RNA sequence: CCAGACCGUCUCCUCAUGGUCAAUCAAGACUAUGUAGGGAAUUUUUGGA
């Protein structure tokens, strides 16, 4: 199976930032991870390219339209590789 | 295993790919369109399931005109591999 | 709870009014009645009428709308 | 002409090769080849040589001071895959490597031409070894690129006839028999990718002197363009009851199209006078692979009550 | 194949942001693996109502904030 | 720029790669993981913008990239 | 009662009016045949660029991904 | 063979041979050749000879850098006489090898080139390179060289 | 300039010669040799029959590539003999022959050309067919008659002197006899597995069934018959039938040369049907399958393949007959398909494609002018007059004549039956039904006309009776309609009780689109 | 070797007492490098 | 069957692959997979010849490729019809 | 030295195929076979420029 998916799964309960097709950059906690990269967040800030920033309670994101998903520096070598 | 795709071998010649197949068989010029204001003219040689075609004597007509104007630039290409997503309409001319 | 596969069946049964939305242009939106049963989102819509909705009277015939280009269904 | 053999070398080959020349003698003959006239034993080479010639598999009629003996041992080393520290020896061995397979091949060809049976099979084997760098007693699983190291060692150390493995059918069984349940399937796959010929041959006399030989050559193995290559040359030798002299020979190419079909092969042979008069119990038809080790399938061409007209 | 966990979001009003600057809103009634969200409300943006229930396609639903957490 | 005659994605793992996206924003980052869709996990993502002249910079992410919108991955400079 | 693909089948050897997504051009002609992935093949094809025609083409073939709808 | 206007290289028409005595030397030369003739798009490979019937790899190649013995071997066999007709350029590096027992091979090769290829009969260009030595006239005679082709240069 | 490849070689004193040329060209070539103009002539192996009187015979390559065994088989000595073969015409008291050879085949040819050819039997191979045929004649009704037959043959008088060739170690009046008996038994016991013959104790009786008899009639081998049996079953398709036809031992003498497989593969793009998945590509069967379709659709074959096609056509008419009549024997209504196939073979056109292409020398340019007058069937061409015909066809005279001939001997036939008792219909009784056929014109001779089938054929018919939904044939008969109007009596077993919507056909074996039919109902008790 | 064990048999040419096939142990020993 | 099987065979040859966006890239093809993930050893570039920002090594994603021209002007076509038949040796 | 032009020297991923292991009341990681497929139309590689 895919290693990135595994990594994502491992990072359940971490502060993960995001970026979509339109460019809306988020930053909050990670609730759940799946085979198809479906992410749900808690206490999620919204800092869009348009400028009108907002602070949201929850948000669920469709996987296909994501550009990239951020993860912190802690899970770099272990325990997912070997 | 074998029959489940080998039956799909004759699906070209009946459905909408029939015309193109015919063209390929008896090479004739066809008008090929694209997404970003393109017009291409060439003759058919090889064919597959998903319109990933190979041609000869390929004339390209498009525009790099920062408006408002029209500039029909021209150049000869041969034996291309046009990925089948970009092809919209193809047709056999007499 | 209403699954979307049984939803199609329901639609087929009742024959309800619809206002279908498109991808490319926001203004022009279709109106009619869905008929067909299909494994894809491809469904046939008898008495289609493309109306320009605000960000008016433009008539149209009968459509089978493509599976990729259906933005909304209502019933 | 073909092999660029010097005239002197050719001459040497002519006399020193014989009808009854054996494995030990072949090496000697090779050593004698005039392309090793400029070779000589040295003092810094000597300890290594001494070490070798104790544990050498092919014995030495000559001794350490002679260069021929040294050459022979180098050849053996090469066959067995022995890279060296003392590179004088290694330099010598490089030369051998570049030209051994040549010379050996030439010798084999000569033998074939002559029509001698004791040398030709042994010579063929030698040639094969030269080509792929291993012994008969090292299993032919070594020449596969994909077969592992652990397995090969196990195979070597188990003390079993090679053909037995080939015969074995089930992958599980194969796995069990290797002392390694892992890779059994792989081994099985590669055993079907090793040549296996269900050969038959019916002889029949056309007249008194001439003898027709209807051969039925089936090929059970499955092809691979990586491992096998373009085609499979299989040198057919019809040889006498003893295996003393060759009657008739021919190189046949088994292509990818043949492997599995009931492929027939016909040929003719005129007999000797004495032979014609009183005839043997059976000749031996022998198909051997020029590349594949321990294929060497040989069968009895029957002559029980074959009364000539 | 793997079911998106939208059982958490059942019976809670959602403020969607679908593709192409369209902010639709509606309560969740049913879900699926394709993400064709069967929701029971649709009011466009200011605000005006254009029909009650709306079944949406999977491809054109990107961001969906839950109003009730 | 030093980058050898490398065969495949497996042989070029753990290298500093430029990555290019659909809209034209340029990235850089060390390629950590592999996948079916080339969802290449970058070790440190410095995204760059070019407006529709000159290239800008950012530093928000150390990311799991998604395959859909990637154009082509270019190698920058080997580690160690 | 009337499903999608049966409708399509019915509409063979009959007029069709096809629309595209990008470069929205009305294609008009008589239908020939279709496959399981919903590609099209028309006869006596006319390329109406928003009402006005570019030229009478004849026997043509259209890919499914660009197509929006199928009408009379 | 290759045209000045049309920049498509005529690959199948010409073939070239370079006879350098030592294998290391040959290897060295090959690299140099590659360096100085990469703009045209030429394959310069030393003779991976191996088998006689297998040697169609050489026919497809344009420039060859052979060792003398190897070259001889190549040219001696039956179904590799199609190469010698296509070989228009035969370069002999270090013709002073003649005095050593190897250079008999070179002589043999030369003889073959002249005498054997008579049914096609179109004699290739023969260029001898060598260290400065006397009896140059004799050498010229051997190689069918007039006062034009002979270039004696001292130390 | 036909073919153009003969020009450039022949222009510099070296002629070309191969099988299946335009006859005129061949004649010209011959003349050029005889006259003393062309010095050298290059000749193929198949044209050893064309004995051009030469002086110095060169024989280049004694190893012919054939795709049966996928290898270079050597020149059989007969061929060599035929080639030399040609005594010295110009130079008196002389004879020169160059034979270019292998070392392995030197002792083979150096002996058997200078010394006589030892003649031996190959009966031991083909005994199955021959024996079956004998049985069918009914001179053999036991396991001693066969022996007797053998004794009157070359096998038995060759096995005495050279017993070891055939596999006899005893070499005595008894042992040999025993061996013969064993052989006979073996031959029999492969026949009994199939539906050939039956043996029962009372010296002991032997007699044929339906399968053996047909084989005997058509001269087809045992193996082929067996193959046909194993594949052909109820509700089989036309493609399947074709495949079956292709798979036979009759096509061992159709040479697949070097670079033929590739050609075949290339061709396969431009054919209607495709080959089955679980057979071989390099074998002759595949070739046969390809080349049969290569003249149903009037394709542009190379002159190598023409010969092959001809060879195939030499063989097929029996085979196709067998195919049609094995299915009849078995009792299935896919016989119609077989019949159709046979018709196509006879002519060279498909059933659905076009009836108008059937007529000798028709092409797609003229077929537009034939469709102008709403001509669907071939019977509409019989009612036409000369003026319209002229307008239609603007070709040479011979072709026109041929067309006319075709029109004439192709009869407009009517289908009328007369049952014995429509009221008294009993189940499982041999109910005879007299069918009274008719022709438009009484034939002078029954000669079939076709361009793409060169060999001549006499016209026949097939009367049929079978239910369409079940696909179970009840009554069949082949007839040679030489009179204008006749009657024929199908003695058939009636079906089970209740209603049965029966349908008669009147399918011709040669001409397509002559499938006259007449459906009717009967209620059996 | 087994003094009362079953073996399959075949027609062929018999090898030398000290032929390579009978001496595999020696070969193995040789392979296990002598001059380390 | 497919024409990606045509590209599978061509190892170590040149192309100037026109992409969806529009760029000319002189490079060696190497092994072309069934998803068309081509791997170029050497690369030229033209960012949105014009303004050159060319690096050497690239691994292309198959979705981007519009027009591939040209390693070899050759026409060797089908492979799978050969293998399907010859493997049917014994039942 | 010796086989090579009538001829696929070389594969990134999922599934199945049989042998193994790491194991819990019926499920995952690895060599190998290509005999399977890759517009599973929407979570990616075949169309939102």
From Swiss-Prot, chain C:
Any one GO biological process: spliceosomal complex assembly
InterPro entries linked to this entry: LSM_dom_sf, Sm, Sm_dom_euk/arc, snRNP-E
Gene3D superfamilies named in the record: 2.30.30.100
Localization terms from the record: Cytoplasm; Nucleus
Molecular-function GO term, any one: RNA binding
Keyword Coiled coil included in the entry's annotation: no
Domain Sm: 5-75
CDD domains for the chain: Sm_E
Keywords linked to the UniProt accession: Cytoplasm, mRNA processing, mRNA splicing, Nucleus, Ribonucleoprotein, RNA-binding, Spliceosome
Pfam (any one): LSM
Other known facts: Present with 556 molecules/cell in log phase SD medium.
Function: Involved in pre-mRNA splicing. Binds and is required for the stability of snRNA U1, U2, U4 and U5 which contain a highly conserved structural motif called the Sm binding site. Involved in cap modification.
Family, as annotated: Belongs to the snRNP Sm proteins family.
Protein name (record): Small nuclear ribonucleoprotein E
Gene assigned in the entry: SME1
Swiss-Prot record, chain E:
Major location (coarse): nucleus
Cellular compartments annotated: Nucleus; Cytoplasm
Taxonomic superkingdom: Eukaryota
Residues of the Sm domain: 1-69
CDD domains registered for this protein in UniProt: Sm_G (cd01719)
Gene Ontology CC: catalytic step 2 spliceosome; commitment complex; cytoplasm; nucleus; precatalytic spliceosome; SMN-Sm protein complex; spliceosomal complex; spliceosomal tri-snRNP complex
PROSITE patterns to which the protein is assigned, alphabetical: SM
Family: Belongs to the snRNP Sm proteins family.
Record function comment: Plays a role in pre-mRNA splicing as a core component of the spliceosomal U1, U2, U4 and U5 small nuclear ribonucleoproteins (snRNPs), the building blocks of the spliceosome.
Cited InterPro entries: Lsm7/SmG-like, LSM_dom_sf, Sm, Sm_dom_euk/arc, Sm_G
Quaternary structure note: Component of the Sm core complex, present in spliceosomal snRNP U1, U2, U4/U6 and U5. The core complex contains SMB1, SMD1, SMD2, SMD3, SME1, SMX3 and SMX2 (Sm proteins B, D1, D2, D3, E, F and G, respectively), and is probably a heptameric ring structure. SMX2 specifically interacts with SME1.
Further information: Present with 1400 molecules/cell in log phase SD medium.
Protein's recorded name: Small nuclear ribonucleoprotein G
Any one GO molecular-function label of the UniProt entry: RNA binding
GO terms (BP aspect): 7-methylguanosine cap hypermethylation; mRNA 5'-splice site recognition; mRNA splicing, via spliceosome; spliceosomal complex assembly; spliceosomal snRNP assembly; U2-type prespliceosome assembly
Alphabetically ordered keywords of this record: Cytoplasm, mRNA processing, mRNA splicing, Nucleus, Ribonucleoprotein, RNA-binding, Spliceosome
Originating species: Saccharomyces cerevisiae (strain ATCC 204508 / S288c) (Baker's yeast)
From Swiss-Prot, chain G:
Sm domain mapped to chain residues: 3-72
Main location: nucleus
Domain of life: Eukaryota
Location of the protein in the cell: Nucleus; Cytoplasm
Entry's Gene Ontology BP terms: 7-methylguanosine cap hypermethylation; mRNA 5'-splice site recognition; mRNA splicing, via spliceosome; spliceosomal complex assembly; spliceosomal snRNP assembly; U2-type prespliceosome assembly
One GO molecular-function entry: splicing factor binding
Keywords: Cytoplasm, mRNA processing, mRNA splicing, Nucleus, Ribonucleoprotein, RNA-binding, Spliceosome
GO cellular-component term (any): catalytic step 2 spliceosome
Assembly notes: Component of the Sm core complex, present in spliceosomal snRNP U1, U2, U4/U6 and U5. The core complex contains SMB1, SMD1, SMD2, SMD3, SME1, SMX3 and SMX2 (Sm proteins B, D1, D2, D3, E, F and G, respectively), and is probably a heptameric ring structure. SMX3 specifically interacts with SME1.
Task performed by this protein: Plays a role in pre-mRNA splicing as a core component of the spliceosomal U1, U2, U4 and U5 small nuclear ribonucleoproteins (snRNPs), the building blocks of the spliceosome.
Other remarks on this protein: Present with 2570 molecules/cell in log phase SD medium.
Stated family: Belongs to the snRNP Sm proteins family. SmF/LSm6 subfamily.
Protein's name according to its UniProt entry: Small nuclear ribonucleoprotein F
Species of provenance: Saccharomyces cerevisiae (strain ATCC 204508 / S288c) (Baker's yeast)
Gene: SMX3
From Swiss-Prot, chain I:
SEC63 domain ranges (all copies): 208-522
Cellular localization per UniProt: Nucleus
Superkingdom field: Eukaryota
Signal peptide positions on this chain: none
Physiological role: RNA helicase that plays an essential role in pre-mRNA splicing as component of the U5 snRNP and U4/U6-U5 tri-snRNP complexes. Involved in spliceosome assembly, activation and disassembly. Mediates changes in the dynamic network of RNA-RNA interactions in the spliceosome. Catalyzes the ATP-dependent unwinding of U4/U6 RNA duplices, an essential step in the assembly of a catalytically active spliceosome.
Domain notes: Contains two helicase domains. The N-terminal helicase domain has catalytic activity by itself, contrary to the C-terminal helicase domain that may have a regulatory role and enhance the activity of the first helicase domain.
Note: Present with 1440 molecules/cell in log phase SD medium.
Family to which this protein belongs: Belongs to the helicase family. SKI2 subfamily.
Subunit structure: Component of the U4/U6-U5 tri-snRNP complex composed of the U4, U6 and U5 snRNAs and at least PRP3, PRP4, PRP6, PRP8, PRP18, PRP31, PRP38, SNU13, SNU23, SNU66, SNU114, SPP381, SMB1, SMD1, SMD2, SMD3, SMX2, SMX3, LSM2, LSM3, LSM4, LSM5, LSM6, LSM7, LSM8, BRR2 and DIB1. Interaction with PRP8 is important for recruitment to the U4/U6-U5 tri-snRNP complex.
Name of the protein: Pre-mRNA-splicing helicase BRR2
Source species: Saccharomyces cerevisiae (strain ATCC 204508 / S288c)
Residues of the full protein shown: 1624 to 2163 of 2163
């Amino acid at each position: 199976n895919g290693i990135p998916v595994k990594l994502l799964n491992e990072a359940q309960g971490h502060i993960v930032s995001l970026e979509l097709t339109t460019g809306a950059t988020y930053r909050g906690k990670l609730v759940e991870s799946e085979d198809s990269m479906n992410v749900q967040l808690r206490d999620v800030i919204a800092t869009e390219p348009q400028g009108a920033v907002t602070h949201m309670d929850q948000i669920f994101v469709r996987g296909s339209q994501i550009k990239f998903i951020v993860v912190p520096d802690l899970l770099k070598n272990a325990p997912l590789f070997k | 295993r074998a029959e489940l795709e080998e039956l799909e071998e004759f699906e070209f010649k009946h459905g909408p790919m029939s015309l193109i197949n015919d063209a390929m068989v008896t090479r004739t010029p066809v008008i090929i369109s694209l997404r970003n204001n393109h017009k291409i003219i060439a003759r058919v040689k090889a064919f597959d399931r998903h319109c990933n075609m190979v041609l000869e004597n390929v004339k390209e007509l498009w525009t790099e005109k920062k408006g408002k104007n029209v500039i029909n630039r021209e150049r000869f290409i041969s034996k291309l591999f046009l990925r089948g997503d970009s092809v919209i309409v193809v047709l056999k001319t007499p | 709870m209403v699954p979307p596969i049984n939803c199609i069946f329901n639609f087929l049964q009742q024959q309800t009014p619809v206002t279908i939305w498109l991808f490319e242009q926001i203004g022009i939106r279709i109106k009619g009645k869905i008929v067909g049963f299909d494994e894809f989102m491809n469904v046939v819509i008898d008495e289609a009428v493309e109306i320009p909705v605000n960000s008016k009277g433009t008539p149209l015939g009968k459509i089978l709308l493509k599976g990729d280009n259906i933005t909304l269904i209502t019933s | 002409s073909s092999f660029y053999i010097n005239h002197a070398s050719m001459d040497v080959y002519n006399r020193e090769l014989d009808e009854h020349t054996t494995q030990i003698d072949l090496f000697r003959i090779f050593s004698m080849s005039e392309e090793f006239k400029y070779v000589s034993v040295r003092y810094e080479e000597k300890r290594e040589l001494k070490q070798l010639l104790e544990k050498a598999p092919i014995p030495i009629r000559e001794d350490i001071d002679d260069p021929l003996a040294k050459v022979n041992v180098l050849l053996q080393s090469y066959f067995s895959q022995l890279k060296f520290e003392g590179f004088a020896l290694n330099s010598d061995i490089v030369f051998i490597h570049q030209n051994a397979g040549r010379l050996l091949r030439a010798m084999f060809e000569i033998c074939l031409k002559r029509g001698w049976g004791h040398p030709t099979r042994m010579l063929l084997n030698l040639c094969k070894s030269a080509t792929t760098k291993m012994w008969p007693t090292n299993c032919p699983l070594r020449q596969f690129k994909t077969c592992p190291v652990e397995v090969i060692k196990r195979l070597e150390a188990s003390t079993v006839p090679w053909g037995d493995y080939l015969q074995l059918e089930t992958p599980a069984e194969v796995g069990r028999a290797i002392r390694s349940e892992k890779y059994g399937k792989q081994v099985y796959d590669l055993l079907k990718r090793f040549p296996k010929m269900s050969v038959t041959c019916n002889a029949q006399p056309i007249t008194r002197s001439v003898m027709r030989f209807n051969i039925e050559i089936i090929a059970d193995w499955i092809w691979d363009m990586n491992v096998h290559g373009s085609l499979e040359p299989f040198l057919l030798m019809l040889e006498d009851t003893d295996g003393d002299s060759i009657l008739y020979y021919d190189v046949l190419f088994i292509t990818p199209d043949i492997v599995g079909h009931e492929f027939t092969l016909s040929f003719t042979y005129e007999l000797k006078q004495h032979n014609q008069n009183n005839l043997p119990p059976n000749f031996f038809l022998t198909l051997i692979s020029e590349n594949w080790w321990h294929s060497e399938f040989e069968i009895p061409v029957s002559f029980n009550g074959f009364k000539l007209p | 194949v793997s079911t998106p966990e939208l059982k958490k979001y059942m019976d809670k009003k959602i403020l969607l942001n679908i593709n192409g600057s369209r902010k639709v809103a509606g309560i969740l009634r049913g879900y699926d693996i394709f993400l064709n969200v069967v929701l029971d409300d649709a009011m466009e943006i200011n605000n005006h109502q254009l029909g009650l229930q709306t079944v949406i396609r999977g491809n054109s639903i990107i961001s969906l904030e839950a109003l009730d957490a | 720029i030093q980058v050898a005659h490398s065969s495949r994605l497996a042989n070029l793992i753990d290298y500093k790669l430029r990555v290019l996206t659909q809209d034209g924003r340029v990235y850089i980052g060390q390629l950590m993981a592999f996948d079916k869709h080339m969802n290449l996990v970058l070790n440190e993502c410095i995204e760059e913008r070019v407006p529709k002249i000159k290239v800008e910079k950012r530093v928000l992410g150390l990311t799991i990239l998604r395959g859909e919108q990637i154009l082509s991955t270019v190698v920058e400079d080997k580690p160690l | 009662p009337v499903n999608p693909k049966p409708f399509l089948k019915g509409l063979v050897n009959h007029r069709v009016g096809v629309k595209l997504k990008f470069n929205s051009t009305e294609y008009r002609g008589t239908l020939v045949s279709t496959d399981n992935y919903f590609n099209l093949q028309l006869n006596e094809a006319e390329e109406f660029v928003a009402g006005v025609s570019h030229g009478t083409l004849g026997e043509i073939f259209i890919r499914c991904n660009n197509v929006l709808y199928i009408r009379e | 063979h290759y045209n000045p206007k049309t920049k498509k290289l005529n690959l199948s028409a010409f073939k070239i041979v370079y006879i350098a005595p030592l294998k290391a030397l040959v290897q060295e030369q090959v690299r140099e050749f590659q360096r100085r003739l990469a703009f045209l798009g030429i394959k310069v490979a030393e003779l991976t000879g191996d088998s006689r019937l297998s040697r169609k790899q050489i026919d497809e190649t344009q420039v060859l850098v052979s060792t003398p013995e190897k070259w001889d071997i190549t040219t001696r066999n039956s179904n590799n006489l199609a190469i010698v007709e296509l070989v228009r350029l035969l370069i002999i590096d270090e013709i002073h090898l003649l005095h050593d027992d190897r250079g008999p091979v070179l002589e043999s090769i030369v003889a073959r080139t002249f005498w054997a290829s008579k049914y096609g009969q179109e004699y290739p260009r023969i260029i001898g390179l060598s260290a400065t030595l006397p009896n140059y006239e004799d050498v010229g005679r051997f190689l069918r060289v007039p006062k034009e082709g002979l270039f004696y240069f001292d130390s | 300039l036909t073919d153009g490849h003969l020009r450039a070689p022949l222009k510099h004193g070296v002629g070309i010669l191969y099988k299946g040329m335009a006859s005129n060209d061949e004649r010209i070539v011959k003349r050029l040799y005889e006259y003393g103009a062309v010095s050298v002539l290059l000749i193929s192996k198949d044209c050893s029959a064309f004995a051009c009187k030469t002086d110095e015979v060169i024989i280049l390559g004694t190893n012919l590539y054939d795709g049966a065994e996928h290898k270079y088989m050597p020149y059989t000595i007969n061929e060599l003999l035929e080639m030399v073969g040609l005594a010295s015409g110009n130079d008196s008291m002389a004879g020169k022959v160059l034979i270019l050879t292998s070392h392995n085949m030197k002792a083979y040819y150096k002996k058997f050309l200078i010394e006589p050819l030892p003649t031996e039997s190959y009966l031991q191979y083909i005994i199955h067919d021959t024996l079956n045929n004998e049985i069918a004649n009914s001179i053999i009704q036991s396991k001693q008659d066969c022996v007797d037959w053998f004794t009157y043959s070359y096998f038995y008088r060759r096995i005495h002197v050279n017993p070891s060739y055939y596999g006899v170690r005893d070499t005595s009046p008894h042992g040999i006899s025993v061996f013969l008996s064993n052989l006979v038994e073996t031959c029999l016991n492969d026949l009994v597995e199939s539906s050939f013959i039956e043996i029962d104790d009372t010296t002991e009786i032997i007699s044929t069934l339906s399968n053996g008899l047909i084989a005997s009639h058509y001269g087809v081998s045992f193996f082929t018959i067996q193959s046909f049996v194993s594949s052909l079953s109820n509700t089989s398709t036309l493609k399947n039938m074709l495949y079956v036809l292709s798979t036979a031992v009759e096509f061992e003498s159709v040479p697949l040369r070097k670079g033929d497989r590739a050609l075949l593969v290339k061709l396969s793009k431009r054919l209607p049907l495709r080959f089955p998945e679980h057979t071989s590509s390099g074998s002759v069967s595949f070739k046969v399958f390809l080349l049969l379709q290569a003249y149903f659709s009037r394709l542009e074959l190379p002159v190598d393949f023409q010969n092959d096609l001809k060879d195939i056509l030499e063989k097929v008419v029996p085979l196709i007959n067998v195919v049609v009549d094995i299915l009849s024997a078995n009792g299935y209504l896919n016989a119609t398909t077989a019949m159709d196939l046979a018709q196509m073979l006879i002519q060279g056109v498909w059933d659905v494609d076009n009836p108008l292409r059937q007529i000798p020398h028709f092409n797609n340019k003229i077929l537009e002018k034939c469709k102008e007058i709403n001509v669907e069937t071939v019977y509409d061409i019989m009612a036409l007059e000369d003026e319209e015909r002229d307008e239609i066809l603007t070709l040479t005279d011979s072709q026109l004549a041929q067309v006319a001939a075709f029109v004439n001997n192709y009869p407009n036939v009517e289908l009328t039956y007369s049952l014995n008792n429509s009221d008294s219909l009993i189940s499982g009784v041999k109910q005879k039904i007299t069918i009274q056929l008719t022709r438009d014109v009484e034939p002078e001779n029954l000669q079939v006309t076709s361009e793409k089938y060169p060999f001549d054929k006499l016209e026949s018919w097939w009367l049929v009776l079978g239910e369409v939904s079940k696909k179970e044939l009840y009554a069949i008969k082949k007839v040679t309609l030489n009179k204008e109007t006749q009657q024929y009596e199908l003695e058939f077993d009636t079906p089970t009780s209740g209603k049965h919507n029966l349908t008669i056909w009147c399918v011709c074996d040669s001409y397509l689109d002559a499938d006259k039919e007449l459906s009717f109902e009967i209620n059996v008790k | 070797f087994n003094q009362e064990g079953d073996y399959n048999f075949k027609y062929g040419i018999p090898l030398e007492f000290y032929n390579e096939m009978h001496r595999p142990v020696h070969f193995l020993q040789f392979s296990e490098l002598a001059g380390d | 069957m497919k024409l990606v099987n045509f590209l599978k065979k061509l190892r170590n040859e040149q192309v100037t692959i026109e992409l969806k966006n529009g760029t000319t890239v002189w490079g060696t093809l190497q092994s072309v997979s069934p998803q068309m993930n081509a791997i170029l050893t050497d690369v030229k570039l033209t960012l949105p010849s014009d303004n050159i920002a060319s690096l050497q090594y690239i691994n292309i994603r198959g979705n981007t490729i519009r027009q591939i021209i040209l390693p070899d002007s050759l026409n060797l076509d089908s492979l799978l019809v050969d293998q399907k038949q010859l493997n049917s040796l014994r039942r």
